[PDB]
From a paper:
The primary subtype of γδ T cells, Vγ9Vδ2 T cells, are activated by the non-peptidic phosphoantigens (pAgs). Herrmann's group and our team have recently confirmed that alpaca Vγ9Vδ2 T cells are activated by pAg-binding VpBTN3 (18, 20). Here, we report the crystal structures of alpaca butyrophilin 3 (VpBTN3) B30.2 domain in complex with the exogenous pAg analog, HMBPP-08, which is a valuable tool for studying the mechanism of butyrophilin-dependent Vγ9Vδ2 T cell activation, and the endogenous pAg analogue, dimethylallyl (S)-thiolodiphosphate (DMASPP). The electrostatic surface of the apo-form VpBTN3 B30.2 ΔC structure shows that the pAg-binding site is a positively charged pocket comprising residue W421 and six basic residues (H381, H408, K423, R442, R448, and R499), making it more suitable for binding the negatively charged pyrophosphate group of pAgs.
Consistent with the results obtained with human BTN3A1 B30.2 domain, HMBPP-08 binds to VpBTN3 B30.2 ΔC domain with higher affinity than HMBPP (KD = 55.7 nM for HMBPP-08, KD = 1.27 μM for HMBPP). To investigate the detailed interactions between HMBPP-08 and VpBTN3 B30.2 ΔC, we obtained the crystal structure of the VpBTN3 B30.2 ΔC domain in complex with HMBPP-08 by soaking HMBPP-08 with the apo-form VpBTN3 B30.2 ΔC crystals. Clear electron density maps of HMBPP-08 can only be observed in chain B. HMBPP-08 binds to a positively charged pocket formed by basic residues (H381, R421, R442, and R448), aromatic residues (W380, Y382, and W421), and a hydrophobic residue (L501). The pyrophosphate group of HMBPP-08 forms hydrogen bonds with the side chain of residues R442, R448, R499, W421 and the main chain N of M424 via a bridging water molecule. Meanwhile, the OH group of HMBPP-08 forms hydrogen bonds with the imidazole group of H381 and the main chain N of Y382. Furthermore, the methylphenyl group of HMBPP-08 forms hydrophobic interactions with residues Y382 and L501. Although there is no direct interaction between residue K423 and HMBPP-08, residue K423 forms part of the positively charged pocket, which is conducive to the binding of pAgs. Unexpectedly, HMBPP-08 did not promote the binding between B30.2 domains of VpBTN2 and VpBTN3, even with its robust affinity for the VpBTN3 B30.2 ΔC domain. Aligning VpBNT3/HMBPP-08 and VpBTN2-DMASPP-VpBTN3 B30.2 structure indicate that the bulky methylphenyl moiety of HMBPP-08 would clash with the loop region consisting of residues 505 to 507 of VpBTN2 B30.2 domain, which prevents HMBPP-08 from associating the VpBTN2 B30.2 domain to the VpBTN3 B30.2 domain.
Author numbering: 323 to 513
Write the structure that this text describes.
């Protein structure tokens, strides 16, 4: 209650609430972006889509519709009871076609879940997270100037992970990744 309230007030003191919608033109051909562009699901197989340059052809990734070149931004994602997901930010210049490892070195700052219970930061090497209360809703917090990407349990204000401070190159995009075919979608919370 107090921890929720402190979490709400910290977001207001410091971070601009981003209104994030998914760009279907970036989505891997196995992903479905909802008609309202807030939700993501996976298909049984690749659907037939143009291989336009911005689309992720290998990684099961999709980007937001707007980038960040400066400032403090947050958005929250309802991951619900999904067994698998990764979210965060990536540089505009990430490899979209060939495989690259999703690491900060390759322009990806993401954390997530595998096999229902394995929380990880996709640092290199990967960081094993210990999470006492598994989140249904995750806040993604960006500070462009200080090279800061951090993640919170948006329901109880508990911290999940902060990447080492870095230097970003060029615009950052919200990025979302699902590998599994399971009943719960990934849904962005509007601003």
């Amino acid at each position: 209650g107090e921890k929720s309230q402190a979490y709400a007030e910290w977001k207001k003191a410091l971070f601009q609430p981003a209104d994030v919608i998914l760009d279907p033109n970036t989505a891997n051909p196995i992903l479905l972006v909802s008609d309202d562009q807030r939700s993501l699901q996976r298909a049984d197989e690749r659907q037939n889509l143009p291989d336009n340059p911005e689309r992720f052809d290998w990684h099961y990734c999709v980007l937001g519709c707007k980038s960040f070149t400066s400032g403090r931004h947050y958005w929250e994602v309802e991951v619900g009871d999904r067994k698998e997901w990764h979210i965060g930010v990536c540089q505009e210049n990430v490899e979209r076609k060939c495989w690259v490892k999703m690491t900060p070195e390759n322009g990806f700052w993401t954390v997530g879940l595998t096999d229902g219970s394995k929380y990880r930061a996709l640092s290199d090497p990967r960081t094993k997270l210990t999470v006492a209360n598994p989140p249904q809703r995750v806040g993604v917090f960006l500070d462009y100037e200080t090279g800061e990407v951090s993640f919170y349990n948006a329901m109880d204000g508990s911290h999940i992970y902060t990447f080492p401070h870095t230097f970003f190159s060029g615009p950052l995009w919200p990025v979302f990744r699902i590998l599994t075919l399971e009943p719960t979608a990934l849904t962005i919370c509007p601003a």
